[PDB]
């Protein structure tokens, strides 16, 4: 590679000439020009990393290059910012002329100058870089060598331990495993049983519980070619000889272990048993997402954080948020490593003190945490690989954890049931008891009975609808309730009522609230009589299938969020496919810190989250969520009762309630046997035959008959016109009786209108002047029929057709005859904030009497014809 | 019977109605239109927008000036009444039809967010041009359907005109049937030669108003009985059907000789540039074409500096106010004056004005452009210009001072490499190696011996040939390199 | 051209190439072939498909299992 | 283009006794105020709280509707 | 070509057998495609060689063959489409065909494996120009891959070498699969080749090399799983997904 170093002198020779290396990162090639920089006798290498900028980040490595400056550096262009791309090019103009006009600096082409570029190939990829082949043409093209040796040849300046995992680490393949090995072999040979063996349970703890998988295994194979009694609150005798290998680790080097793993099963008891086992640690909860990057260490004077005390001494750290946490500043701190214990300061700016028996230690977040994702790779060669050991084929482990509570007694009533139903079909069920303990522990509103596993048979029961919907959960249910003895929307007498309540078992911290079942068919109902029946109680629905950021949180300015510090609750539905994008910023909101971030806002005095499902596709992220229950859908007896109650004041007319409400019922069942579509959520309801019984209580219709004429809007003119439209009242006639009638009426008058069934009223004193002039049509009478139906009941409409034969035309007819005025709005680009919200204006003069105006014009037209 | 589709549109207009004007590219679309404003009157009033996304999406209805109110164009359009034309509006935003929904609404209607409606006065009329998701815009809109014919309107077009042909109606249609057939495999190497910008009968029009000229460089006569004219005005007459591309050189087989006969061939390959930007210039506006790199533009830039009048250059990719008063637009003195005027990398910050300014130096009127101040018809000796090697080998290695008898195979290693190195590197590294970085490569090779000692160039080029190729090699291919540093020997 | 064809070795004792991939060849020049990995660079007698027992176009069916000894 | 996360605002002036949000200038309808909606089904699929809920009504084209008087009093 | 019955029949089989494999890729591809603007056009070789007339590779080829089928099929943000070899070429579906499982049935019925070559160098120009055709007419902008298919039965690799370098320059991929035997301890790592040596006049001097040192392509996955190439595959997507 000094073949490179001398190229590079040559290279070195012509100055204003732009270079550029490619090949492999970190494998010597910086180091290069490091070694180079004193044996030049020039300045001392810069360097700025550029992934993004903000052109006072960067003015300044140009700033610096005046002056008899070094020259300017850049560490990687692959994944380059596309902001700051063209007045770089500026730079490979060597006869460039640089006036920049933020602070009106001129500038020339400096002598002492030389665009150092550095840059990695794509890989596996069909072309990667953010480089144009253009932008490349003004660039000394070069590639870095690579010795195999190089591993041998480190650990013979110095013996160590991370000298085998220098590059060791990264394979994570066969082949460089192999070949890897046969380095170490070579190292072997070099100045064994002592690094053999601990080379060996490095190897081990590499996969102690990543994965079951064999490639220690055959690691351990191909090394045989090649060849405590610590004191804490808990023992852990699974962590034993795991402290025995972070003790060495922290002993024989200063090699940082980096855990990554499953909380609560290993990554919490280890730093409680090494801090009672031994001291001179700051043992600190330090998180890094929205953290400032020097208050971190602490800055201003110069205030300290708590990294500068474990900088300043130590035997052990605790970071954590450090997969969710910015690459750029833990690259910063790439020198507390085996290097100096020390980083970079400003204004204290003091070295600071080293031992190799310091050992930084941080984790990574538990294996459902979508943060745990976006790993930085440059952090996994340069450290110690171990896994949190989980729990399986073990049932002991979970009764540490429940016998440390005051009542000894979940030890005895946990297992059993949790066998049972591992029986009927478990470190999820341990998460589940773990839960379990926290609800309970929580509870302390009753005496303190033995009730607790009375409650924990709903979270665990009850919630197996989830992973297998079956007819036969309701007894598998009723034999857990079996075990359980043996351990130890309306008021409505249907379980409807019994879900109520059942909910409200649930409502110990209740993070979110999950469900499952047909969405809306009580489940929304069961929410507005929350809201009915505790008063102060706001809610708002809100859908989620396609849908921003900037739909729920503004500019600040939302629905979601000036309902949010506000109230106590909001309602959710169809969450079955969310955008995963914003599903980032629902897990960032509120878990129990209230405030969000991605821009941030501080919310939660207090405030509750509902939720539903559409039976797929769904992340962990989803089954991450703290809570989760199945609802109790309605039974047919049900509807009919609520109904019952409701409406029979006048001719309950229950077994015609009876044949109504089954027509729309078994018509789903018809329709998910293909009984034709025309849209998406093309399903039925009780709404439906809930306004079948407001339009038969219908006051006057002047007509004593309205049985069976009704279904020609609610069976009939939903569906499309066509030949199986007939088949619907084939279905219905084999159900009910036949009648038909009179097809049309229309005639009107200047008082009144009569459309078949219905009349209607007609203002004097104004209608709206309607051009292209209009007259009735004797087809379709029977939707304007419906559409005065709508607006006598006040319902809202939405018509479908294949943009011919009149949609607005028909509205626009009968707003003539009897119409206020009309105000149409084309949708066609307007989002939330266009359909409500108008704009600014920077005046707003002549706009506003625009309305004076107009009130003036309507009021004196009918002040002067009365 | 063009005039079929004539007759048609003034049905149409009878009843002051919109309408939807579509066709095959390049029909003359803006053609019968630029042709009916003579007609009925309104060409020195009319509202015309070839398309604004990037220079427009609000400012044609307008906004306010902090302290002042500044009315848009269309709502002058629409309010003081006359034509409005649209062009290609399917390229359009979303944006944009949301209010010309509003267009075909009742009224005719124009409203603001001022407070206002504005309502079509007398003289309105909306007109579309086109080559989606507003069915309305479809339903009211009279779909007419422009096609101009083969084989008997183009010798009918010129013959009554400039008539002058015996042997043009055999060799137009010959052009043209083959530039749209090859039209179809020049796009199946898409490379560099690409999409093609299509070709219009408008631009043999060009090459009428191109026989022209070579009756100047001749008398005339019934018939010039002259071969070299007739194989000259061989390939320069298929030469104005095509512009800078790729340069693959498929065409240039069949371009020479592609009626019966012909053959191929400081400036040597710029003469051929320098030549053709002065017929370009010689045939001055409604056209100018250039999609060459300003970079080796900027010969042409110095050369017509220095002919017999000047010119200059603005960038038009950041935002331009000299274009207009603010004190007056400084360009608006290079159009009062004579001299020219490039656009450096046009990016559509603003060339609404530009548009008009197109077609101004032509017979009938055309004013450019008004302000509010110094509004002008155009200047009678004005060009713009427009902006975005295989004769050089010998300049290239002209690079060197010289004083020794140089080996010429010093670029013959430029070529033998650049040959290679679209074939065979072994998939460098991941991706083309390059085809076109190497000849810039080869010059700057050159200027690696500058800022160099005093010593010699038969060492440095077997040095610096390794330094050339060096990732070029990969360290797969690196015996044919070692045959690349012979060559220097 | 001519096809490449793949050759597998095992001796009349079960002997063992795996097997290798050459150019189209005769039924005479793998003597060679034979003794460098023998590494004692000896005449063989030979035979395979067993068809109708084969020792160029008797080489010509395709995978082969070479039989061979020395005689 | 209407993005159904839009009409989730009119969630609150719809089948329920509504109120809509806009500090405090929160506004409920007037007692002659209707809705009214349209959409062509190639684009369709309004959302489940507005096909279950509101009403929907086809319309097929006009000249397959049509009887021949309402074709006479028609240019036709 | 084989009766169109009993290929319906072993493709319904290999569309059971795979039929969790291929439902929990694709689901986890929808988690991922979503963010058009550009697109993939996508083709598979089909070998019909002695190759697969040996190691009964067949099984476990069919059925990825059928997975990645039944995946691709339900994506739908670009084009797929089919075609065979043995020294012959044969398409079977284009992009724009839309599939059938008797379309797979079909594929399978025109297999015999009875070769004695392959003209993988005539496959890679044939497959380049229907991806030159199908970039033609689609505009304008979008990738395309062929998948190469067989244990490797090549006559040369130095045409193949520059065939490689000028479709790189297309901006398509051509991904190997180092099909390998799984009823054999056959493998490409003991898979030996001769050298030739004229220069020390050949025989005395056969040098003993690999078939992997003289191999042309640079992206390529040994096998003996049907899931390896279906997860690797994933990853390709995945880093299309996260570019576009």
Not at chain 4, 33 to 59: C, H, Q, W
Not at chain 5, 37 to 43: A, D, E, G, W
């Amino acid at each position: 590679v000094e073949k490179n170093m001398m190229n590079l002198v040559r290279a070195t020779s012509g100055k204003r000439f732009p270079v550029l290396i490619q090949g492999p990162t970190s494998s010597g090639k910086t180091s290069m020009i490091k070694y180079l920089a004193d044996i030049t006798g020039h300045k001392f290498v810069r360097i700025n990393n550029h992934e993004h900028t903000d052109l006072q980040e960067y003015l300044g490595v140009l700033v610096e290059a005046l002056r008899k400056g070094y020259w300017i550096v850049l560490d990687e262009l692959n994944l380059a910012p596309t902001d700051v791309l063209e007045a770089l090019n500026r730079l490979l103009d060597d006869n460039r002329e640089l006036f920049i006009p933020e602070t009106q600096e001129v500038v020339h082409p400096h002598p002492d100058f030389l665009l150092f570029a550095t840059q990695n190939p794509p890989g596996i990829y069909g072309g990667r870089k953010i480089l144009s082949r253009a932008f490349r043409n003004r660039f000394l093209e070069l590639h870095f060598d690579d010795i195999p040796q190089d591993e041998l040849e480190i650990i013979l300046r110095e013996r160590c331990q991370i000298a085998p995992s220098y590059a060791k680490k990264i394979v994570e393949r066969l082949f460089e495993q192999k070949n890897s090995f046969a380095t170490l072999r070579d190292l072997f040979r070099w100045a064994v049983g002592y690094e053999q063996l601990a080379a060996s349970g490095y190897m081990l703890l590499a996969e102690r519980c990543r994965t079951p998988q064999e490639k220690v295994t055959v690691k351990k194979t191909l090394e045989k070619v090649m060849k405590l009694e610590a004191i804490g609150s808990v023992t852990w005798t699974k962590g034993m000889r795991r402290l025995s290998v972070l003790v060495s680790s922290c002993l024989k080097n200063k090699e940082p272990v980096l855990l990554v793993g499953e909380t609560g099963c290993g990554k919490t008891t280890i730093c409680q048993l090494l801090a009672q086992f031994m001291g001179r640690e700051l043992i600190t909860l330090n998180a890094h997402q929205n953290t400032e990057t020097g208050d971190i260490l602490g800055a201003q004077e110069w205030s300290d954080g708590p990294l500068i005390q474990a900088m300043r001494t130590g035997n052990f750290f605790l970071l954590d948020e450090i997969s969710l946490a910015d690459d750029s500043v833990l690259e910063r701190l790439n020198s507390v490593l085996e290097p100096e214990r020390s980083l970079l300061l400003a204004e204290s700016d003091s070295l600071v003190t080293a031992s190799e028996n310091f050992q930084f230690f941080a984790t990574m977040n538990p294996g459902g945490d979508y943060g745990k994702k976006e790993l930085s790779p440059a952090l996994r060669n340069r450290f110690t690989e171990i896994w949190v050991p989980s729990m399986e084929d073990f049932n002991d482990v979970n009764m540490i954890v429940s016998s440390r509570l005051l009542e000894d007694l979940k030890d005895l009533a946990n297992p059993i049931v949790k066998f049972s139903e591992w029986f009927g079909k478990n470190a999820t069920s341990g998460v589940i008891s773990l839960r379990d303990i926290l609800a309970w522990v929580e509870f302390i509103n009753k005496v303190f009975p033995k009730i607790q596993n009375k409650s924990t048979a709903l979270i665990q029961g009850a919630s197996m609808v989830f992973i297998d919907a079956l007819g036969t959960n309701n007894t598998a249910y009723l034999a857990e309730n079996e075990n359980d003895l043996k351990s130890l929307f309306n008021l409505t007498a249907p379980t409807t009522a019994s879900n109520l309540v059942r909910v409200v078992r649930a409502m110990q911290v209740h993070k979110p609230i999950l469900l499952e079942g047909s969405p809306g068919v009580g489940k929304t109902s069961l929410i507005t009589a929350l809201a009915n029946i505790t008063g102060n109680k706001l809610t708002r629905i809100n859908l989620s299938e396609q849908t921003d950021l900037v739909d729920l949180f503004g500019a600040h300015d939302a629905p979601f969020l000036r309902a949010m510090k506000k109230g106590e609750w909001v309602l959710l539905d169809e969450m079955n496919l969310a955008s995963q994008s914003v599903l980032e910023g629902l897990n960032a909101c509120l878990d129990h810190r209230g405030e969000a971030y991605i821009i941030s806002f501080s919310c939660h005095p207090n405030f509750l989250v509902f939720a539903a499902q559409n039976p797929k596709g769904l992340p962990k992220s989803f089954v991450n969520r703290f809570s989760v229950v199945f609802i109790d859908m309605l039974t047919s007896d049900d509807l009919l009762l609520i109904a019952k109650h409701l409406y029979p004041s006048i001719e309950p007319d229950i077994i015609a309630k009876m044949i109504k409400l089954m027509s729309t019922l078994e018509d789903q069942v018809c329709k998910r046997k293909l009984w034709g579509n025309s849209g998406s959520p093309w399903e039925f309801n009780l709404r439906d035959t809930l306004r079948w019984l407001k339009l038969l209580n219908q006051y006057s219709i002047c007509e004593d008959v309205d049985v069976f004429d009704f279904v020609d809007i609610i069976v009939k003119q939903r569906f499309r016109t066509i030949s199986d439209k007939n088949k619907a009242q084939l279905l219905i006639e084999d159900i009910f009786g036949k009648f038909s009638t009179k097809e049309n009426f229309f005639k009107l008058t200047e008082d009144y209108v009569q459309i078949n069934n219905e009349v209607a009223l007609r203002n004097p004193h104004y209608r709206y002047p309607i051009t292209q002039n209009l007259f009735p049509l004797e087809c379709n009478v029977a939707v304007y029929e419906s559409v005065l139906k709508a607006i006598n009941n006040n319902w809202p409409l939405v018509l479908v057709g294949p943009s011919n034969s009149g949609k607005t035309e028909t509205i626009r007819f009968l707003a003539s005859i009897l119409g206020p005025r009309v105000d149409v709005f084309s949708m066609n680009s307007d989002i939330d904030s266009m359909d409500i919200l108008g704009g600014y204006e920077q005046v707003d003069l002549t706009r506003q009497i625009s309305y004076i105006t107009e009130e003036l014009t309507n009021i004196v037209r009918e002040i002067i014809s009365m | 019977k063009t005039v079929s589709s004539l007759r048609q549109l003034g049905r149409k207009i009878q009843n002051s109605t919109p309408i939807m004007l579509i066709g095959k590219a390049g029909s003359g679309k803006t053609f019968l239109i630029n042709e009916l404003s003579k007609y009925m009157g309104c060409h020195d009033s009319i509202v015309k927008i070839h398309l604004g996304e990037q220079t427009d999406a609000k400012l044609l209805i307008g906004t306010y000036t902090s302290f002042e109110w500044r009315a848009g164009v269309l709502a002058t359009a629409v309010k003081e009444g006359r034509w409005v034309l649209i062009e290609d509006i399917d390229k359009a935003p979303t944006d944009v039809l949301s209010i010309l929904l509003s267009l075909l609404e009742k009224r005719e209607l124009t409203i603001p967010s001022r407070g206002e409606t504005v309502k079509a006065a007398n003289g309105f009329q909306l007109i579309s041009t086109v080559r989606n998701l507003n069915m309305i815009g479809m339903r009211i809109w009279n779909v007419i359907e422009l096609e101009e014919p083969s084989e008997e309107d183009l010798t009918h077009i010129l013959a009554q005109k400039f008539p002058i042909l015996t042997n043009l109606i055999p060799k137009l249609i010959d052009s043209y049937k083959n530039v749209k057939s090859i039209y179809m495999n020049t796009k199946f190497i898409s490379l560099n030669k690409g999409a093609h910008t299509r070709v219009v009968s408008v631009r043999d029009l060009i090459k009428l108003c191109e026989r022209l000229d070579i009756l100047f460089k001749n008398n005339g006569i019934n018939k010039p009985d002259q071969l070299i004219q007739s194989s000259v005005y061989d390939s320069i007459f298929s030469e104005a059907a095509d512009c800078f591309a790729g340069a693959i050189g498929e065409f240039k087989a069949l371009e020479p000789i592609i009626q019966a006969i012909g053959e191929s061939l400081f400036t040597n390959h710029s003469l051929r540039l320098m030549e053709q930007i002065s017929v370009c210039i010689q045939m001055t506006e409604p056209v100018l074409l250039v999609g060459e790199t300003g970079t080796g533009k900027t010969t042409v830039v110095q050369q017509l500096a220095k002919m017999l009048a000047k010119k200059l250059t603005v960038i038009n990719v950041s935002q331009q106010t000299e274009t207009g008063d603010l004190v007056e637009g400084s360009l608006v003195k290079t159009i009062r004056a004579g001299e020219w005027l490039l656009l450096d990398e046009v990016n559509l910050a603003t060339a609404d004005t530009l548009e008009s300014i197109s077609d101004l130096l032509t017979e009938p009127d055309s004013r450019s452009i008004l302000l509010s101040a110094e509004p002008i018809k155009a200047h009678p000796d004005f060009r713009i210009f427009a902006c975005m090697d295989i004769t050089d080998l010998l300049s290239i290695i002209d690079k060197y001072i010289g004083k020794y008898s140089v080996s010429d195979e010093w670029v013959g290693n430029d070529i033998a490499e650049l040959y290679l190195e679209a074939k065979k590197l072994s998939d460098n590294n991941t991706i083309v190696d390059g085809s076109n970085q190497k000849p810039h490569f080869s010059i700057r090779t050159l200027t690696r011996t500058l800022l160099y000692v005093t010593d010699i160039i038969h060492i440095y080029g077997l040095r610096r040939s390794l330094y050339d190729g060096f990732c070029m090699s990969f360290l797969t291919l690196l015996d044919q390199k070692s045959e690349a540093i012979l060559k220097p020997v | 051209d001519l096809p490449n064809v793949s050759i597998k070795f095992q001796a009349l004792d079960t002997g063992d190439n795996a097997l290798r991939v050459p150019g189209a060849i005769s039924e005479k020049q793998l003597e060679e072939l034979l003794n460098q990995l023998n590494g004692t660079s000896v005449p063989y007698t030979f035979s395979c498909t067993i068809k109708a027992s084969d020792p160029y176009s008797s080489l010509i069916k395709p995978q082969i299992t070479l039989l061979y000894t020395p005689r | 283009l209407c993005s159904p996360s839009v009409l989730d605002r009119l969630n609150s002036l719809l089948e329920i006794d509504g109120s809509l949000l806009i500090q405090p200038r929160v506004l409920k309808p007037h007692p002659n105020f209707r809705l009214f909606l349209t959409m062509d089904p190639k684009y369709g699929e309004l959302s489940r709280a507005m096909r279950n809920r509101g009403v929907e009504i086809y319309i097929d084209e006009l000249h397959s509707r049509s009887t021949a008087f309402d074709r006479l009093t028609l240019g036709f | 070509e084989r009766s169109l019955e009993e290929s319906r029949e072993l493709w319904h089989k290999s569309e059971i057998s795979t039929a969790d494999l291929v439902s929990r890729l694709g689901e986890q591809l929808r988690l991922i495609l979503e963010p058009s603007k550009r697109q993939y056009q996508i083709m598979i070789a089909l070998d019909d060689s002695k190759s697969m007339s040996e190691s009964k590779c067949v099984k476990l080829a069919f059925d990825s063959l059928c997975l990645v089928s039944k995946t691709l099929t339900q994506l739908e943000a670009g084009g797929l489409s089919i075609v065979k070899f043995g020294e012959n070429i044969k398409e079977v579906h284009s992009f724009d065909q839309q599939f059938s499982n008797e379309s797979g049935a079909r594929a399978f019925q025109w297999f015999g494996f009875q070769e004695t070559k392959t003209d993988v160098k005539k496959l890679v120009a044939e497959s380049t120009k229907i991806f030159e055709r199908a970039r033609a007419m689609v505009h304008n902008d979008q990738w395309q891959l062929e998948i190469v298919i067989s244990d490797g039965i090549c006559e040369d690799h130095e045409t193949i070498q520059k065939l490689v370098r000028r479709a790189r320059e297309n901006k398509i991929m051509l991904v190997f699969v180092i099909i390998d035997g799984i009823t054999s301890n056959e493998s490409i790592l003991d898979m030996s080749q001769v050298n030739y040596i004229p220069d020390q006049y050949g025989n005395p001097q056969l040098k003993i090399t690999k078939y992997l040192d003289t191999f042309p392509f640079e992206f390529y996955v040994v096998v003996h799983d049907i899931s390896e190439l279906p997860e690797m595959l994933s990853l390709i997507l995945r880093q299309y997904f996260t570019d576009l």
